[PDB]
Design a protein around this ligand. Structure first.
Ligand code: NI
Ligand code: NI
Ligand code: NI
Ligand code: NI
Lengths: 388, 388, 388, 388
């Protein structure tokens, strides 16, 4: 009755997560840098399936074409030695001062062209390493003040950028899809496409919408006070959940990036329930930061904790849905009726159906209790392993 | 140099706004009810263009077909006497206990059919009164707990509802469009389609998307900590801003519905700037509540205040955009460059353009300051009428 | 290994909690009213220790002196029949329209005098029924706008009110203490004494500070995004935690009043840990609302759930502190060193101690990891009953 | 009719504000470092009264006693050359990795002793430079997880630290007072003494309370969604506002530190109104950050903007309080009655006064409107300079 991860569980980590040195807006690094090769090795030992990277995590900004080759070759050798995969890659368009007003929607046109070239270069690298998903997080696309950015022009520029990227992968014959990662704020005062919904809407305006989906992050939707499982359900409904980032957040404040399971524990339970129920089959990626209070031992403890907490929640959610008492409570709360069409009989039969209105007993309907609290206490008992 | 509204300004109010009696979750009504006919009269005297209604604001729930006719005829006479119009109408699907688990996405199928019949009935009434926009606010669509609602099934049901409504207006030959009004929470723990972005995305999945747009509300996006002007810009970009609701909100807390201009005053300034600049031509609707501390004199003072504050902001934003010093600062901050295509030369020329990457001087670009703070202080001076 | 409450567990409920009819700002009551006598009976059957009341919960506003006697006598008989106690009482100074601008700090002086008389009358009643704690929640003390309330004058008035109440109980020889209940907002735009800290500070300015403490509520501090267990620790440190209100809240939004255990589950765990560890011996009072989706069966299910979730958390926290692996991790994280004085040797020895500064090896100290993540994963394993 | 600051206006800035290089959690510095001597010079040219510093802003961490002397002597010469004063100083106990778990409440006892020695050393320096106020911001005192910190022990340690500091300044005969600066979160998950109220309460438990007050910051109380002017009024009421930090914040999110006037503009108006009305006579200190989008020209523009926006608000608030129409509206809203004692006649006369209860006409009182909306629209007109 234990919780050891296997590469079959598809757990992945970014190089930048366990390799975060602990620098925050008020303080210096508390840990030395990690060689990517060591991270790949340590993570493989913990049971992880693969790793992800920003271009600049793997190849130091300003590297010569040959230094580049050397960096990649060592990385590739660590992957061969461990069996680790690289399912996703992304571009760093936020750290260098040149991106201080954004990458794809910077006001300066020459910066936007440069942002696209830096991206295209890394897409080729990611296809070579086998990635299937290319993520875009526009961390610097946004503003601190109202006049600094015309948002209709900036969306035109954002669409222009993504359309060109889609032209490029289709012309090269690459099999890779894009995933946009929303965040409402930080480091910009307000960021463009702030939530899963804004990114889903945007995508429908691209030339080839089928090439793009979303990469939602637990803590990001919670920084807007939103229900993350609800957001994920809408993305699944639209057919657009191409990737997901897992972590923990305690409410509306700075982006904490705690390990998965920390923060809002019940939201984590309902998220795992939904992913496993909908048969989500992509990576379970952790975008998190071991607190700067920790040494390297606490770093690996924190990474193990991410995977452990997913597997415990997976087991409690599976026990909840398999419990006959729970299946009866779902029927008592009429979840089965929610799944049936309101009016498969069609508009005309509905208009002619007097039991839908003229003779509907509104008082008897209103008196029916929904029985949601007992259902929710059953879900609580199961999460806490208190089923008696 | 004053600020009197005229019916040309297209200011509208819901019957439920100035007619709110002051009941809140912790206290009794502090004001008597208003006859709709008196509200129409008082508002006409204040300079308003028109009024809006929920079915149940105008016709008491449970009214006989003849009481109904009487209520409508008196209303129509007040409109004829004053020249007031009715540009928008909506359905009350949230007050009656029968809607306690929602209208279109209630778990009980018979409640969902009833919700659609109650709606269709009011669409006919709204077309008779001349409305051009039919608003839907699903205030009860949502949940307090994770197991109570499968969100993929509920979105199926929501889409089913809106598709049927669109079939009905097209079969009747009615010229009316729908506008969905998002809200993140309250009165449900979490509400479905919580933000402008989620509603825009949803619409793209309907059978006839062209029939539907959004009706965003200032306070609702701010209850999620989001930038309302940014949200409106995205709706304008998508061609979907069919209506708008104006009011004030002080941050993330219960829905305050203060008069427009109250709450976040700078957001109000940038919103007015954007609406007038984009040539938004629909109603300027106020969805607000005079505080329950007030008597009827304070009610009409609060309603006048809404319109006054819009006209003052309109004048300050127009002065800001006409100021030659501001047009020069916009150029200094490269807003003009934001509006130009990144790569009208096409993908291949970009890939071959060495100044976009191989020979891009990243250090010189990064050193360019954006000059946003002086621009923002110019916007502040103009808002405060302190231009010297 | 089960979780049945007994009157020894000191669980109490307000009449207004299970008796809430479901009216919210957007909808009608969904449940009939409960007779106080039935609530006392049902709660006794569930294992509760006692009940609490507002004056107006027990005696309808505007009751004649004799109707009053009748209401009290029936109540007293239900208490005798069940063994239930009344440890706390409070005043309703927020529902009647007369309190729309507050009770003790209303701008109208005659309303403030009336507020004090209504209070004094109920203190006598509470002493007769045996209450030991008199709670004050100034739900209407505050403002929607900046000019409406001078806050220094209002604090003068608040202090005046509480000093007079203390003069009265000391002159009558009553053994009862007062507890102030903070809330940051709702129903007023901002409420005075918004958090536990503001109320603790205020008390130190009263004539007889020893007579007053706080009654913090889980959801209220969380509506300000604060850490409720931290807040409770500060109140315990000051010797001022005279009572506590338990419930659940999902983040910063309207006051949800969910059952205890719902909302932020980890905060609930750390709260129970602290109360049991500090030996808090007052009532465990639930101030919560069964969702309006529920019928009376769901009401009693929700109330049982409050007590069940406390007892489960109590058992997991006790298991955590008794676990030898956890006691070793606490030592590894230096919690033992936190409890020792920094400088019991005194100022002069510290100034003369060169190992505190001149010869302190700052680099070796900084490299020590705090081991907090493993400790926190041990706390998680224990909460989820996953200890292996 | 313009807005030029003079040293009489008592405007001050921290060295760390205009000298912030632009490093944030996601990106590199965008500006070179500033020599303290140049900042003192540039600020003097802008009209500032003085500067403040952390020990480590002025003397690089790890400096020899002689390098120290050199740094101080150049600084002192810049002060002599410009006439600038140093009214406040503070300690950096948050940047160095040694303070990763706090300074005064770190779990490691040797770190806490070192924190006190680093502090005492800087108090002597501050007294030499003439400061009157010594500020303490415990940015690292707090936790990311529940078990990492026992908050009652940590408050014991915090009190121990401040008592020793007070023993030291009294034994040295120094005339300097302490001011504690609260913040609810960031960089720790939750920080101890999170709001003005918590710090006021804490102080009352110190050995010599009269030596300590608060230094509230606009953005910090707003990160908890609180009303900053209300908070300042409570501090003034307690006699404890020894210093204040001014800046701008857009709601509940990461600490933005925008220039004063940005963020919530109406809160800024009511704050200035209160400070000038209560005769606050300390420094008007700006703790803010010029956005990293800016070059040095935008840095000085942003600093000028702080002072300009204070002087504009000062003029609008003074015009509001001097307006006879406003004085009449204050009387109409009964602000004059708020300032009168509720019961100067005493408890016994109140108990015997039948007009306070037996014969109080509650219905007539309730019908009185408070007239707050017209008052608030007068305040808006004055702020926008739209008085007609
Ligand atoms: Ni994040
Ligand atoms: Ni609203
Ligand atoms: Ni509450
Ligand atoms: Ni700050």
């Amino acid at each position: 009755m234990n919780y050891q991860p296997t590469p079959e569980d598809r757990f992945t980590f970014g190089l930048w997560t366990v390799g975060w040195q602990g620098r925050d807006p008020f303080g210096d690094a508390t840990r030395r840098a990690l060689d990517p090769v060591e991270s790949v090795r340590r993570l493989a030992e913990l049971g992880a399936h693969g790793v992800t990277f920003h271009d600049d995590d793997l190849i130091p900004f300003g590297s010569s074409d040959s230094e580049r080759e050397e960096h990649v070759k060592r990385f590739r050798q660590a992957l061969d030695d461990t069996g680790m995969k690289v399912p996703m890659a992304t571009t760093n368009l936020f750290t260098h001062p040149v991106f201080k007003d954004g990458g794809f929607t910077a006001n300066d046109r020459d910066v936007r062209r440069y942002a696209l070239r830096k991206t295209i270069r890394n897409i080729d690298l990611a296809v070579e390493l086998g990635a299937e998903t290319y993520v875009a997080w526009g961390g610097r696309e946004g503003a601190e003040s109202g006049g600094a950015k015309d948002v209709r022009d900036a969306l035109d520029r954002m669409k222009e950028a993504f359309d060109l990227l889609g032209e490029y992968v289709t012309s090269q014959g690459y099999d890779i899809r894009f995933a946009i990662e929303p965040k409402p704020n930080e480091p910009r005062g307000d960021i463009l496409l702030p939530t899963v919904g804004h990114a889903l809407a945007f995508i429908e305006r691209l030339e080839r919408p089928e090439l793009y989906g979303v990469n939602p992050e637990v803590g990001h939707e919670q920084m807007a006070g939103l229900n993350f499982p609800h957001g994920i359900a809408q993305a699944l409904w639209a057919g657009k959940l191409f990737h997901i980032d897992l972590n923990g957040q305690n409410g509306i404040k700075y982006d904490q990036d705690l390990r998965f399971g920390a923060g809002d524990l019940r939201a984590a339970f309902w998220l795992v329930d939904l992913l496993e129920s909908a048969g989500y089959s992509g990576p379970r990626h952790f975008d998190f930061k071991p607190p700067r209070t920790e040494d390297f031992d606490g770093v690996w403890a924190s990474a193990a904790g991410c995977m452990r907490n997913y597997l415990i929640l997976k087991e409690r959610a599976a026990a909840f849905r398999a419990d006959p008492e729970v299946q009866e409570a779902l029927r008592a709360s009429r979840l089965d009726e929610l799944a049936r069409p309101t009016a498969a009989d069609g508009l005309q039969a509905l208009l002619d159906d007097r039991s839908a209105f003229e003779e509907f007993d509104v008082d008897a309907a209103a008196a029916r209790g929904m029985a949601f609290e007992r259902l929710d206490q059953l879900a609580m008992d199961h999460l806490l392993g208190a089923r008696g």
